[PDB]
Amino acid sequence: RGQVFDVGPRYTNLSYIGEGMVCSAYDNVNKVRVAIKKISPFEHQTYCQRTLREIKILLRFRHENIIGINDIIRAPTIEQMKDVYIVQDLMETDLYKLLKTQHLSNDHICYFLYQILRGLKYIHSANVLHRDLKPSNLLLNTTCDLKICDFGLARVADPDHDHTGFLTEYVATRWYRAPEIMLNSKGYTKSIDIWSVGCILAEMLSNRPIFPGKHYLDQLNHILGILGSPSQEDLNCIINLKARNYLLSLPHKNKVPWNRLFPNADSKALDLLDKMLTFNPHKRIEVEQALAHPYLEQYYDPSDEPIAEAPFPKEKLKELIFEETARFQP
Numbered sequence: 001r002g003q004v005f006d007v008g009p010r011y012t013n014l015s016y017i018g019e020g021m022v023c024s025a026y027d028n029v030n031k032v033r034v035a036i037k038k039i040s041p042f043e044h045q046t047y048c049q050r051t052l053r054e055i056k057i058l059l060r061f062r063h064e065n066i067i068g069i070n071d072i073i074r075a076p077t078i079e080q081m082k083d084v085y086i087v088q089d090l091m092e093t094d095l096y097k098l099l100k101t102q103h104l105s106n107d108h109i110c111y112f113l114y115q116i117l118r119g120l121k122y123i124h125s126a127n128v129l130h131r132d133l134k135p136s137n138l139l140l141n142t143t144c145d146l147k148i149c150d151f152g153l154a155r156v157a158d159p160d161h162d163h164t165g166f167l168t169e170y171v172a173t174r175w176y177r178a179p180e181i182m183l184n185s186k187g188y189t190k191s192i193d194i195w196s197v198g199c200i201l202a203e204m205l206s207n208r209p210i211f212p213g214k215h216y217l218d219q220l221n222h223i224l225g226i227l228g229s230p231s232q233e234d235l236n237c238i239i240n241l242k243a244r245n246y247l248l249s250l251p252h253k254n255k256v257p258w259n260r261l262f263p264n265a266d267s268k269a270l271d272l273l274d275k276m277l278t279f280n281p282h283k284r285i286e287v288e289q290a291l292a293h294p295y296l297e298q299y300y301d302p303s304d305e306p307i308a309e310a311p312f313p314k315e316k317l318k319e320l321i322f323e324e325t326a327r328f329q330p
């Protein structure tokens with residue numbers, strides 16, 4: 001152990017996983033090990049907001065490629081409730097850990113990408129944006145089943161309020177941020193997630209992040225270094241003068257061909273990558289088009305790619321977390 005990890009007698013024999021804190025544990029009712037994360041969010045409003053949003057989303061979603069919540073453990077009263085524990089299916093590894101050690105065959109890349117997009121189709125069908133897709137948020141088991149996790153930054157899509165100024169600060173993981181985040185976008189459209197998936201695909205191809213920016217504007221430097229300078233048409237879509245004039249200030253950069261960056265990659269994988277890593281978010285491929293792409297033809301089956309049945313102050317938010325978790329109480 002490290003601290004109080006107080007999960008009733010249902011869950012026993014705890015092993016540390018990572019870091020609030022995550023442990024595996026034996027579930028004495030279902031007779032399997034499970035993952036459990038301790039969330040002590042109530043002293044920080046940021047952790048509380050992300051806790052409630054995640055719980056609400058994950059309890060509504062039901063999909064093979066999205067991690068569920070199996071159980072939530074907390075004290076019987078608001079006064080006694082200092083922590084919440086979320087119990088989820090235990091997955092042996094994640095794509096971040098796997099890519100640090102293992103070469104993926106083209107077949108593995110294809111199947112992982114299929115499952116990411118299949119999960120994402122469901123999320124987007126519920127009018128939700130994940131907004132922090134990255135290898136460590138893709139859980140894997142030993143048979144290569146994949147589950148999307150961490151909905152702490154997820155939002156309902158809101159394309160009419162997507163516009164913002166140049167260099168607006170952003171929360172989600174830097175290396176997977178679409179170029180428009182740095183230029184004119186709050187990340188309130190589905191195209192933000194597709195860019196992250198493109199980055200993940202590129203990372204699966206070479207085991208290295210494609211755009212490892214070291215700070216905020218360096219991320220755009222990395223993206224433009226491979227895509228090259230945006231076209232006049234793509235620039236004309238950027239009405240914000242600060243962002244536009246920044247881009248016009250840069251020396252001309254040529255496109256680096258994908259087949260030079262990824263000489264061992266399948267050509268169909270690179271055609272799909274090109275379409276996910278499109279600079280102009282309006283021209284970027286959508287999740288259903290991505291699934292229908294020739295690269296995924298061995299798996300594509302829209303009848304087996306389900307969609308969601310419908311669209312989706314700390315003191316009141318501790319109350320809302322209490323209410324939302326009530327169904328798991330004895």
Ligand SMILES: *CCS(=O)(=O)NCc1ccc2[nH]ncc2c1
Nearest residue numbers: 022035088089090091137149150
């Ligand atoms: C979803 C990525 S984190 O939440 O950062 N990692 C913690 C978890 C959560 C659920 C798991 N199931 N198996 C392993 C897990 C790790």
